[PDB]
Write a protein that binds this DNA or RNA. Structure first.
Ligand SMILES: [Zn+2]
Ligand SMILES: [Zn+2]
Lengths: 665, 138, 110, 96, 101, 98
DNA sequence: GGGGGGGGGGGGGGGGGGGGGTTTGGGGGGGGGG
DNA sequence: CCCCCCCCCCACCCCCCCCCCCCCCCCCCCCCC
């Protein structure tokens, strides 16, 4: 009964007044029994919300604003006490309330997941609870330039001073909880707007997906604020010296922080590869091309002015359209007739992990401030230059064990970590000769390959498509690195036989299945496939034998369905698709498999005036391909007019006519 | 073997209508109007031998202005366009759509024939109107 | 359990033109430099105006259009003149970031 | 059955031109001349309502000065229906 | 705007407003069924000071002393109540369409 | 013995209709006559020269659907129907039989 | 290893219910009579 | 020239619409050939 909930909220409100407040004689001042009150609040979290799976206390604590109005004041004032004392050297007690404040922050910032195992109460309360965590993240990053962050590192430093052995289990746990605090503060992110599907949709959809609370803007939550507050509290320095000092109880949270820093930021944004106004002028010219295009597709006179075109077909029958531009351009008339159809084919549809490169829209970017850009790129630079190989060895040498018990989230975050920093160092080393590929040498050490192979193989066998996609990305970066070191050169030949047979088959099977999965899944399949083919060509077991495993129709469907997003794709992605087509069609000469109308449609749309950029390099590749493709299609139809029907359909898997269809004698 | 663009309800080929108007929008001499109407005694070469609507289109391009004013009787002077006057009077929306598009097309044709430095992007951006007048009895 | 579906903001499309307009305007606002009848101790007028707003706890900023017109080949001023209604939210995003950078007290009624 | 406190001597004062969004739901003290005064009508204060479906009565709503009461659904049958003022359990206050 | 659902006391917030007074279409709570039944939380919602003012064509600029043309102008925030009737003013802002709501 | 109750009918592109005279035999009658491809034209126009005939034929055969959706329906019935397979293999069997 | 058949989800159509759609007084301007 | 008059100006059925329910189609999975 809700009587219990209002009683609980009354209790937490009374506890909220017990913690402390401002003293007018303004400074924050602790309450009587304040340590016992903090312990009792920790006990409320345990006693009710954990033990009964409710999150009611986690809601009530936010209602009475304890985190923002008591705990961060306590920690920041305690930080100032200890800072001033350090310069000028009953802290034995106040240390305890600082620690219990940190425990409460770790609890209240603890990441939220919703599953079939969650209670009905939890999944009901999930949204507003996420919103309150976002207010917490804003306050933690903003308040006194986030001085509580230095409070957290100081609490950790006061057990890093003592010996490696002298750090007791309590000290080890305390350092781990400090890492979980920083991880959580990175990890809070706006929740998904999750809708009941029993009742039908109205005549309009959801009015907005925005789930922020009114006192928050997205910039308050953005990475930029994280970088600024972490720099101004030297959290980056703390993490860098911590990973340098590793010489392993805390290694998994320490990896996890770097994952949460990397999961959604693109490496190219840290490299350039009147400047802002100049580039804005470039952007505006580019969209002005689309303006002149739609203007060509627009009437010179008012909408009520419309006369009627009639398209008499090649047969003695007539259609009718009102388009004034179409009246003098039959292309527009035909396509407008097709646009007018009310009918569509109905299309069928298609969680405990955060948003990332695994599931973001493919053009998403963090727009850094240049100070934060410098601070972040130099932080991850110094990490790579110190902490990478040691950390990766520590955690991968963990993950050699306990693979059967590795939780799905842990698997995907490990794979993303691997991929992200390997990709970054490859890119930086392409940009700087001063940067060295050997600085990520741990990636190529054979245990790492074996584990990544075990992860991808088990994920695919389990049909865990999330982790399969993660391992697919990690494999792409492993192969990418392999190609770079094959040029920069032994271990290359080791992995180039260890990946034989069933691994070749597995890699050949992802782009068969990819057509059934999201754009990013398909993109990673294409990326992996391009890397695989360039690797095998660089080596060249037999080259014809392997590529035959790729040149099959579901792979062509996956490439087509990827290419169907052509406007939203990037020039390099289209280049990779058309290099694959160059191989299949020009080099391998299995041209019959691409004589199908879906490709014809897609080629026309992208070569259209409202298709690709006229100046695009990828448009040049498409044009080159299309010229050769049309010439061969004309030639095959001239030799075989049955293909005028066959163009409509999948090719005949009946070999006895299929060979004749494929080659025409 | 091919589709045909027809002014609906009329059996008029739009392509033929377009050519019949284009070949008057260029190559028309204002002397032909003085052959059509009264004051035929006052033909004067230095005012009547100009390609009159190209003179209009070039001044119009220099001023960069969208409108071409067109006395309807001029269509009856030029041999290939006499029928198009009746098509205009009876089916004006479609014929005017054709004439607008043809003016824009001829602006492009003039700058590419002269391979001029004037902005193709301007002409492509610009909408172009014909403003036909002096149709007949008021 | 309640049959339901999750809608995610991260798959949204962001207008790169608007984001770049925001960046250009943000840079302009924080460092547009001028001074007159004095040495070259440039006032950086709109940063100083944010400080004036903070002192008087105002909620509006006055911008001279010509100052945008001279800035960075005038492309920003042309864009904000022509297509203001698209770019106003992007301008307010840029302004909010600048005020956070130099006057974070103003982000609330305070 | 009730007492109303009258808040005398409120220190800050506004003229009618001077009121703004930031004064919304605030207490204010205002100067003016009464220009048009209507009659002394009764107005609903506490009102139980009847759903014309199911067991009719709904608990007493409190009427404001600004809008009619809305009953989105009848809390007994948890559905839409017609609604009507309960003639026994309703009480009136003066309004002007 | 900010609203609370009639059948569960969840709150929607930061609802952007069109020219009509606009209410949410879906309830954020997946345990709840609702579409279009709301109460506005006044204290959480955000308002702007607003003032329409009508202008007419300047007396010296009317081409022959005829009837002037008119236009509706919207002031908001700190710009409200600065203008006055009979005053001759320069404005800057956006030309906009307004539907029949 | 019973008075009728109505039930909504539905029509979809059956393989029989796809094999009517206005079906694939229309393609065989008209495609090589109507599509023309040349080096004298750019790739976009040549692609359009294909697409125009197939679109007009698709609409005249089954006007209900959009051209792309029609193409998906055609590809999927091509993936499945046995009589359509016997017809298609009969085309390439006839070319073999030349 | 591919194609058919069974089972479940999702979308579209069809029906049913409901709500909406000139007199009298006063001030000020403008014109006419003493 | 001044004052009074008088004239003007103003305050039950049918359609659209929405909600609910049922059927049919299309995809996926498993078995059979
Ligand atoms: Zn009821
Ligand atoms: Zn609800």
């Amino acid at each position: 009964a809700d009587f219990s909930l209002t009683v609980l909220r009354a209790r937490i409100a009374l506890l909220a007044t017990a913690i402390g407040g401002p003293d007018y004689t303004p400074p924050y001042k602790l309450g009587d029994d304040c340590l016992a009150c903090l312990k009792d609040l920790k006990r409320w979290f345990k006693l009710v919300d954990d033990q009964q799976k409710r999150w009611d206390v986690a809601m009530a604590v936010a209602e009475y604003r304890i985190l923002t109005d008591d705990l961060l004041p306590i920690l920041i004032d305690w930080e100032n006490k200890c800072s001033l004392a350090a310069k000028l050297a009953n802290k034995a007690y106040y240390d305890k309330i600082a620690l219990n404040c940190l425990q409460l922050l770790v609890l209240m910032t603890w990441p939220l997941i919703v599953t079939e195992q969650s209670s009905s109460n939890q999944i009901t309360l999930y949204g507003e609870l996420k919103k309150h965590q976002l207010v917490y993240k804003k306050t933690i990053l903003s308040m006194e330039s986030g001085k509580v962050l230095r409070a957290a590192i100081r609490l950790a430093l006061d057990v890093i001073k003592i010996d490696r052995l002298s750090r007791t289990p309590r000290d080890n746990m305390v350092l781990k909880l400090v890492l979980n605090f920083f991880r959580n503060v990175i990890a809070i992110e706006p929740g998904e707007f999750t809708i009941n599907t029993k009742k039908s949709m109205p005549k309009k959809g959801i009015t907005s997906i925005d789930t922020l609370p009114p006192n928050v803007s997205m910039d308050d939550i953005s990475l930029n604020t994280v970088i600024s507050s972490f720099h101004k509290n030297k959290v980056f320095g703390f993490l860098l010296t911590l990973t340098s000092s590793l010489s392993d109880f805390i290694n998994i949270p320490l990896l996890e922080i770097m994952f949460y820093f990397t999961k959604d930021v693109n490496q190219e944004l840290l490299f350039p590869r009147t400047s802002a106004g100049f580039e804005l002028s470039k952007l505006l010219q580019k969209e002005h091309q689309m303006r002149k295009n739609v203007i060509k597709h627009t009437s010179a006179r008012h909408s009520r002015f419309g006369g009627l075109l009639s398209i008499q077909t090649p047969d003695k029958t007539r259609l009718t359209v009102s388009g004034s531009q179409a009246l003098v351009d039959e292309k527009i008339a035909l396509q407008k007739l097709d646009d007018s159809k009310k009918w569509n084919k109905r299309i069928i549809k298609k969680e405990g992990l955060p948003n990332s490169l695994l599931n973001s829209q493919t053009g998403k970017a963090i727009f850094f401030t240049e100070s934060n850009g410098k601070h972040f790129k130099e932080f991850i630079n110094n990490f790579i230059d110190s902490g990478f190989n040691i950390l990766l060895h520590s955690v991968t040498n963990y993950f050699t064990t306990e693979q059967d018990r590795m939780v799905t989230l842990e698997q995907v975050e490990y794979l993303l970590f691997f991929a992200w920093f390997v990709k970054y160092q490859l890119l930086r080393s392409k940009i700087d000769n001063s940067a060295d590929i050997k600085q990520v040498s741990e990636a190529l050490k054979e245990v790492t390959f074996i584990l990544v192979s075990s992860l991808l193989r088990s994920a695919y066998d389990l049909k865990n498509w999330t982790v399969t996609h993660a391992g697919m990305i990690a494999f792409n970066e492993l192969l990418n690195l392999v190609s770079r070191t094959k040029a920069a050169q032994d271990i290359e030949f080791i992995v180039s036989r260890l990946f034989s047979d069933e691994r070749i088959q597995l890699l050949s099977n992802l782009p068969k299945i990819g057509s059934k999965y999201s754009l990013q899944f398909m993109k990673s399949c294409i990326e992996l496939t391009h890397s695989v083919l360039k690797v095998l060509e660089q080596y060249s077991v037999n080259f014809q034998k392997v590529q035959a495993n790729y040149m099959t129709e579901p792979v062509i469907e996956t490439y087509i369905n990827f290419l169907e997003r052509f406007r939203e794709l990037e020039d390099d992605s289209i280049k990779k698709v058309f290099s694959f087509f160059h191989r299949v069609f020009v080099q391998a000469k299995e041209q019959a498999l691409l004589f199908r109308f879906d490709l014809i449609i897609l080629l026309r749309e992208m070569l259209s005036p409202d298709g690709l950029d006229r100046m695009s390099r990828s448009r040049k590749y498409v044009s080159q391909f299309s010229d050769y493709f049309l010439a061969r299609l004309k030639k095959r139809l001239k030799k075989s007019p049955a293909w005028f029907v066959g163009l409509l359909f999948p090719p005949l898997h009946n070999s006895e006519v299929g060979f004749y269809q494929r080659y025409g004698e | 073997s091919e589709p045909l663009r027809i002014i609906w309800g009329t059996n008029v080929s739009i392509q033929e209508c377009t050519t019949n108007f284009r070949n008057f929008l260029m190559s028309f001499k204002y002397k032909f109007r003085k052959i059509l109407d009264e004051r035929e005694e006052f033909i004067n070469n230095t005012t009547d031998e100009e390609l009159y609507y190209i003179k209009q289109l070039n001044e119009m391009r220099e001023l960069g202005t969208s409108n071409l004013n067109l006395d309807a009787r001029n269509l009856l002077a030029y041999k290939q366009t006499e029928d198009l006057y009746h098509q205009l009077l009876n089916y004006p929306q479609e014929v005017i759509s054709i004439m607008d598009q043809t003016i824009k097309d001829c602006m492009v044709s003039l700058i590419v024939d002269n391979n001029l430095d004037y902005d193709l992007d301007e002409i492509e951006t610009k909408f172009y109107k014909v403003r036909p007048y002096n149709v007949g009895s008021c | 359990s309640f049959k339901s579906r999750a809608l995610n903001h991260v798959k949204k499309v962001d207008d790169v033109t608007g984001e770049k307009v925001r960046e250009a305007f943000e840079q302009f606002l924080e460092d547009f430099s001028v001074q007159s009848t004095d040495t070259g101790e440039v006032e950086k007028v709109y940063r100083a105006q944010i400080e004036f707003m903070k002192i008087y706890d105002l909620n509006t900023i006055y911008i001279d259009y010509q100052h945008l017109s001279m800035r960075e080949n005038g492309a920003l001023a042309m864009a904000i003149s022509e297509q203001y209604y698209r770019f106003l939210p992007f301008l307010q995003k840029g302004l909010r970031r600048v005020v956070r950078k130099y006057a974070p007290e103003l982000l609330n009624t305070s | 059955s009730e007492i109303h406190v009258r808040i005398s001597d409120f220190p800050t004062i506004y003229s009618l031109r001077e009121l703004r969004e930031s004064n919304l739901s605030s207490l204010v003290r205002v100067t003016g001349v009464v220009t048009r005064r209507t009659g002394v009508f009764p107005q609903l204060k506490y009102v139980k309502f009847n759903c014309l479906k199911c067991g009719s009565i709904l608990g007493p709503f409190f009427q404001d000065s600004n809008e009619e009461i809305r009953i989105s659904f009848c809390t007994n049958c948890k559905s839409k229906g017609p609604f009507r003022v309960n003639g026994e359990k309703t009480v009136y206050r003066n309004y002007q | 705007a900010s609203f609370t659902c009639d059948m569960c006391r969840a709150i929607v917030d930061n609802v952007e407003q069109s020219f009509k007074y606009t209410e949410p279409t879906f309830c954020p709570n997946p345990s709840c069924e609702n579409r279009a039944f709301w109460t506005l939380n006044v204290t959480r919602s955000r308002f702007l000071d607003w003032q329409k003012v009508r202008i007419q064509e300047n007396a010296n600029e009317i081409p022959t002393g005829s009837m002037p043309r008119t236009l509706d102008v919207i002031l908001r925030g700190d710009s409200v109540e600065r203008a006055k009737p009979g005053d001759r003013c320069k404005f800057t802002g956006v030309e906009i369409v307004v539907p029949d709501v | 013995a019973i008075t009728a109750r109505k039930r909504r009918p539905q029509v979809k592109l059956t393989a029989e209709k796809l094999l009517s005279d206005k079906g694939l035999p229309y393609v065989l009658k008209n495609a090589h006559k109507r599509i023309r491809i040349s080096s004298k034209k750019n790739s976009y126009d040549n692609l359009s020269n294909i697409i125009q005939f197939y679109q007009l034929w698709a609409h005249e055969l089954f006007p209900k659907a959009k051209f792309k959706d029609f193409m998906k329906i055609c590809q999927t019935v091509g993936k499945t129907d046995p009589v359509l397979r016997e017809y298609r293999v009969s085309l390439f069997r006839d070319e073999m039989g030349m």
